[PDB]
Design a protein around this ligand. Sequence first.
Ligand SMILES: *[C@@H]1O[C@H](CO)[C@@H](O[C@@H]2O[C@H](CO)[C@@H](O)[C@H](O)[C@H]2NC(C)=O)[C@H](O)[C@H]1NC(C)=O
Lengths: 48, 49
Amino acid sequence: NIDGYFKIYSKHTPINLVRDLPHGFSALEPLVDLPIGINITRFQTLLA
Amino acid sequence: SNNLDSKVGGNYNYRYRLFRKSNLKPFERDISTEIYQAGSTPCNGVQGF
Ligand SMILES: *[C@@H]1O[C@H](CO)[C@@H](O[C@@H]2O[C@H](CO)[C@@H](O)[C@H](O)[C@H]2NC(C)=O)[C@H](O)[C@H]1NC(C)=O
């Protein structure tokens, strides 16, 4: 969130590894921008 | 817009913010109506001295 514009960059995998996060380079492409204008101070992710 | 927005007694629907603890940032919108501390007291209810 930057001067009233929220920004998102993201990526998804080729990897089927043992357990922990691989060290490795794939950058996140930009995907969306939203003029939300709010103070975000905190957050929470949503599960199934 | 006097020709449109004014009323002979005064168009008292038009509101602005008069008191704040700090400034707001570039392009911020503050929707709040909580009672302002100019008094040092932990001020609560619809007023305070
Ligand atoms: C967004 O809301 C937060 C939470 O109230 C604000 O952070 C507080 O700011 C006051 C004044 O500096 C402090 O007394 C609190 O301790 C702060 N809380 C935290 C978590 O740091 C924040 O300033 C607001 N953002 C904007 C742009 O006004």
